[model samples]
Target: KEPEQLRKLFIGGLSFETTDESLRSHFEQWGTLTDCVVMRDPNTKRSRGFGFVTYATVEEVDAAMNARPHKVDGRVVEPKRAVSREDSQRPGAHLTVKKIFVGGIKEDTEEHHLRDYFEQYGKIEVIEIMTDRGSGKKRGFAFVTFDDHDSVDKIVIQKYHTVNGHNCEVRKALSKQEMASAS
Candidate 1:
């Protein structure tokens, strides 16, 4: 299926030190900018290190992609055509997400337990615990999304973290097909 092209480009691989002001200026050179956003932590107000840049015209998105090797704060960046949600979560393409995939959760472990463990890192937007369709029981695995992507880095920097004595597996959220393939 052909993904619909969009003027909004997904810009990734930004430096931790990158700021909104710097990001806007860097991409505006490509063409007339409509909107630029550098996702940040609502609480800490720090950069998420990735953002969306919307061009006034689709030609600008193409121009930016063609330009390639875009840099800011002395680091290289990757700008690609934004994949809409309809084109994501499939077998082939996966969206660049700010969510984390957590496994090995004990059935008894409650949301508060997860909250206490993750709140220190940054602001949390959502924490979902998957449940079985028929039995409606806890699936022992979950997905967590944070307002800022920096929490992902903070979680990864740690060594062998656990939830309620279980050595849970923690990584980036998986697409629907990715989860199915692993199963």
Candidate 2:
């Protein structure tokens, strides 16, 4: 989507040196600003080379697009509209995951790959794999969400088996944090 259509935009191609003050200053030139969040390495305290810029109005976001020209700090930046978390996993909300789980998995299996591999059992609401920011690599575990708790339980008992040519086990995920930690 175009920046003019987005009230929030994903700001990528960041320099590790970028700070909240600098981000807000640059982004405000486009419109009334709300917030600038630069995601950082929780362990290393360094910018993750990406962040979110929320504008007070869509017009402002559009005007700000020219500020970067798809480049930041001498590097080409690829910015896009940020996805809404509210659209993903609100329990009791229409389109939310009723249940989700974490599991041991064969290395190299991603959330989509796991969802497809297990979908033979039933429809899936969501599947997420954990990752480490240091390397942005998968953590060899995943969580699966279903439309209801019953479906999750059914899969837990019936589909705990091999994955990616290796034996794997599935169990209910306790935290929404773990369920969507990667994605």
Candidate 3:
């Protein structure tokens, strides 16, 4: 096995109840933590359901990775080594995730509505609605990630998908140029 090295790791699928103190105490068992933080919403100050942990040495990082499928705050979390923006955005660093963009959503649409609407397609892994940072109003769009990539394509292929009177624009997230040109 290759030698482990100290690195930053991003933790995902955290529970809203998880806190920074809890996160530090839990991961400290595996290694020396330089820093551990549970992200929170700036407005509501609620758990954003994700965080990052920085290990002081490779030994701890290796130990943590070997631990595998860690359970935190009553939920299993996925941990992956973090990358710099320049590295992730560089050539050949593309990632093809199983995520779909749901547009034309009504402002009053609730979280359950998204679950009820998209649940017909497949098992949803994560559902997040974009909201205005200052106003906390619905941005009329959402990102639904399904456990199965097939559901993504299914949503895209299906036509006339909408919620209530809103015309549901189901598709992949557009690129910078596409977004700029569309509006």
Candidate 4:
């Protein structure tokens, strides 16, 4: 039988110093692991700061994921279900998009503030802070579009941000049709 992708987890936000052995040691605490790896650059041979871990069973994967906010090498890391190519293309998957949805924004934060904060990642194409048409007030969210796709990936990897003292959540933007299909 082939390895089930469902039993594999994608580990992100890893520290550069984290190695294959260290990664295995960290996740093995949850359950027995079939395989573990820390991805590296072929040319530079340096850690890519992310990796994959496979467990013997789906239940083990659940136990690992439920542990949440995993940290390794003094940095917070993320563990998510590894999806196949088909599933990766589906809505809500971790694929990169030029535009990202940002939620939990403070009501008082302005467009200029967001632009300033995100511009550090890359060239921003647009920033749309959603507002209530009737009340003309912020809806506590916004959509930010960058000129390059990798910008979104960089943002997502960081995973969390604080803007104007309020924690903000960021994710790839999905169209209404895509959102409907996902549900």
- Please give the clash total of every predicted structure, in order: 0, 1, 2, 0
Query: Alpha-carbon error at 97 in model 3, in Å?
Result: 9.3
Q: For residues 1-183, could you state the per-residue lDDT of candidate 4 as single tens digits?
A: 335676788898999899999899999999888989999999999988899999988778768876877998888997776756664664676864799989999888888879767998789999898999999978999999998765675566554687777679887898888788778
- Model 2 residue 183 CA deviation (Å) reads 18
Flag regions of model 3 displaced more than 4 Å: 1-6, 90-183
Find the candidate with the highest lDDT and give its number.
Answer: 4
| TM-score-based ranking | 4, 1, 3, 2
Q: Which residues of candidate 4, in runs, are more than 4 Å off?
A: 1-3, 90-92, 95-183
The regions of model 1 sitting more than 4 angstroms off are 1-5, 95-183
lDDT of each: 0.74, 0.62, 0.72, 0.81
- Residues 1-183 of candidate 3 have per-residue lDDT tens digits of 222222666787898788988888889999788889999999999888999898877567757866877999788987765545554553322233468778888888877888877888788888888999999977888888888654564455445676655678776555567557656
What TM-score does model 4 achieve against the real structure?
Answer: 0.52
Positional deviation of 157 in candidate 4, in angstroms? 20
Model 1, 1-183: lDDT tens digits are 112245777788888987767889998999877778788889999888898888888767667766777898899986755656654543334344578888889998888878878788678899898899999989998888998554664464344667776678777676778779857
Return the clash pairs for model 1, or none.
Answer: none
Residue 168 in model 2: lDDT:
75
